[PDB]
Design a protein around this ligand. Structure first.
Ligand SMILES: CCC[C@H]1C(=O)CC(=O)O[C@@H]1CC(=O)/C(C)=C/C[C@@H]1O[C@](C)(CCO)C[C@@H]1C
Ligand SMILES: CCC[C@H]1C(=O)CC(=O)O[C@@H]1CC(=O)/C(C)=C/C[C@@H]1O[C@](C)(CCO)C[C@@H]1C
Lengths: 121, 121
């Protein structure tokens, strides 16, 4: 149903850390888009701290005039959802875009694998 | 059948540019992982030049001691394939990883959307 993706975004975005963490399978992973070129793997016991830190910085970004915008998930496998996102200014200038790949099993997130397009130089 | 993904990799990898280009729908797009943080969109009439340039640099990389390694596609929609890849050294040290998202329609590639994990600093 992909309802767990909506649950994850609603809770994480509102700072309801505990609900957001519980959207993940006990063996699930959230892999960040950076991590020295390899991505940083966070297991379920590390995801609460990641959400807290990311929300703190989203707050700073918003105050700086930039925020993220997420599209509704495009479902492929019934078990796979692609959430496209942008970072953009108030007047809609897109400065970064990327994707969240969600792999689901049994109503829980087994993988959230995040990628961004790269700014070089 | 995702056979067009295999056709694309075989032809592109062998420098059979024309076959590789014809794997794409006439409205298909290949979006690179970089492009100033937004990805660079290449339409079908631009894909041949991209393959030629990428193969030239793959050759230089190989001579420098690094090459790409691609996994078989994980199919989700029957119309969607995720090809994971790494850049690694001869002795298997992984220095970069990323994904190719293939969207297929009617036996042709409508989107090849490429992402890499980001090395920061
Ligand atoms: C300033 C660095 C840019 C972003 C990062 O690279 C991670 C980080 O630390 O700061 C930023 C984070 C950022 O741009 C947004 C807009 C995050 C959105 C929020 O993220 C949650 C936790 C869900 C996952 O996206 C809830 C909400 C959607
Ligand atoms: C040195 C920069 C690193 C790579 C880029 O960021 C694009 C570029 O110019 O050089 C490199 C390219 C690279 O690392 C490999 C290994 C490409 C593989 C080949 O690419 C083809 C065209 C299919 C698409 O992958 C066929 C073959 C699989």
């Amino acid at each position: 149903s992909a309802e767990v993706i909506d649950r994850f975004f609603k809770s994480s975005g509102a700072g309801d850390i505990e609900t957001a963490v519980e959207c993940f399978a006990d063996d699930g992973q959230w892999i960040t888009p950076d991590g020295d070129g390899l991505g940083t793997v966070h297991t379920k016991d590390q995801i609460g701290d990641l959400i807290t830190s990311m929300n703190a910085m989203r707050e700073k970004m918003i105050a700086s005039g930039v925020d993220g915008k997420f599209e509704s998930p495009i479902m492929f496998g019934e078990n796979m959802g692609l959430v496209r996102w942008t970072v953009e200014t108030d007047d809609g200038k897109v400065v970064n875009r990327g994707v969240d790949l969600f792999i689901l099993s049994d109503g829980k997130i087994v993988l959230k694998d995040v990628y961004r397009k790269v700014k070089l130089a």
